[PDB]
Design a protein around this ligand. Structure first.
Ligand code: HEM
Length: 381
């Protein structure tokens, strides 16, 4: 049973759903452990409850009958999760993340080089939408000619057709790489082994589709919302980053705490318990609202303000917590750092369009509402 999580807050505007800080403050102050009769869900907003739901799989299972949304990795609890996680993790080593940085830098340099003389840019079409698709295509090892945005657009049934077309495209590339191994994700998934078990070629195609669904639109949203913040939240932050070019990672971590909305994951209660202060029964569904708990003043001082120097920022739960903690988190942080650093090198100052209207430039997405357009005036020094 697909649970329509959109019906819990019932937002009055796309703009509110895009940045629901008023609703987070209401739930944290008045209703932090909230039973929603219409969806038959429990809803938790406080940092210590959200963290417990995400990680304590003995009590809060990822593999229940009801959900908020090809290996089903995200739907497995330990012990069955260990093999799937280990085989996919073979493509996300410390060595690969080190080797990816100069490749991702090249891609960012080319995207920014295309807009370097622009008086005005559109973050979405010029940067946030193409960049994570161009990156994942390079990291997969796709032929240079195919270097792909189309796929994830369509991968959003339209869905049956698109998945069958991706499969026919990639299946012969995996077979080819099995005989012709290179430093790319597909080659690392071919060589992966757990207790003598390996992926089949078909499983590797599915693994790449899971990585596309996990890592493209999420990263696009995170980048667009970071640039949104520089225009609309702390308008002095961009200047601070220009003045000290080592601050990019701190800025990325604060934009993942402050401007990624809405982050929520569901679990199914596995055993009766009152760990969240209320009696729950086996089969109950709990939604953990990570974006809300990222503004819990018990963990984050001055939580409704941008502060890239807040020493707790690295504790945000935008990537989850526990066994399912985002496999892509290092890559996501690297992509956001590299695109921000390339942008800072090109542009001395950015300004919003006085006439930009948010409501007409938001569309429904898996995370709530996403920018369709984000204009800015840019300057060079
Ligand atoms: C800003 C970007 C991203 C965000 C906000 C994000 C968020 C998340 C979250 C919250 C989970 C945990 C789900 C849960 O507990 O139920 C997760 C899992 C995962 N993410 Fe990410 N993600 C991002 C980028 C990426 C990228 C770039 C990749 C890969 C290229 C990726 C691959 C995955 C995978 C494979 C899992 C499943 C791990 C498991 O279930 O063991 N993600 N992501």
């Amino acid at each position: 049973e697909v649970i329509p999580v959109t019906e819990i807050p019932k937002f009055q505007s796309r703009a509110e759903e895009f940045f629901p800080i008023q609703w987070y403050k209401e739930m944290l102050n008045n209703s932090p452990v909230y039973f929603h009769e219409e969806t038959n869900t429990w809803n938790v907003f406080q940092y210590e409850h959200v963290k417990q739901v995400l990680s304590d799989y003995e009590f809060f299972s990822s593999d229940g009958q009801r959900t908020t949304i090809i290996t089903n990795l995200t739907n497995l609890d330990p012990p069955d999760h260990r093999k799937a996680r280990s085989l996919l993790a073979a493509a996300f080593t410390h060595r690969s993340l080190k080797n990816w940085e100069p490749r991702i830098k090249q891609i960012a340099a080319d995207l920014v080089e295309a807009i370097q003389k622009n008086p005005t840019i559109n973050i979405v079409d010029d940067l946030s939408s193409p960049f994570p698709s161009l990156v994942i295509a390079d990291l997969f090892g796709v032929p240079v000619k195919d270097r792909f945005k189309k796929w994830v657009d369509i991968l959003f049934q339209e869905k049956q057709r698109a998945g069958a077309e991706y499969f026919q495209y990639l299946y012969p590339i995996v077979i080819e790489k099995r005989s012709n191994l290179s430093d790319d994700i597909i080659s690392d998934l071919i060589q992966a082994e757990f207790d003598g078990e390996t992926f089949t070629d078909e499983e590797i195609v599915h693994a790449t589709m899971l990585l596309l669904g996990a890592g493209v639109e999420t990263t696009s949203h995170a980048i667009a919302n970071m640039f949104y913040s520089f225009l609309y939240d702390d308008k002095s932050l961009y200047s601070e980053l220009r003045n000290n070019r080592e601050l990019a990672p701190k800025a990325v971590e604060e934009m993942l705490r402050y401007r990624f909305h809405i982050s929520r994951r569901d679990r199914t209660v596995k055993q009766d318990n009152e760990l969240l202060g209320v009696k729950l029964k086996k089969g109950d569904v709990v939604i953990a609202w990570m974006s809300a708990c990222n503004m819990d003043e018990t963990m984050f001082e001055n939580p409704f303000s941008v502060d890239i120097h807040r020493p707790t920022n690295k504790k945000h739960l935008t990537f989850g917590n526990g066994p399912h903690f985002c496999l892509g988190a290092p890559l996501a942080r690297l992509e956001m750092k590299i695109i921000l650093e390339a942008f800072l090198e090109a542009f001395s100052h950015i300004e919003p369009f006085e006439d930009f209207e948010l409501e007409p430039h938001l569309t429904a997405s898996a995370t709530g509402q996403s920018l369709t357009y984000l204009p800015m005036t840019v300057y060079r020094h």
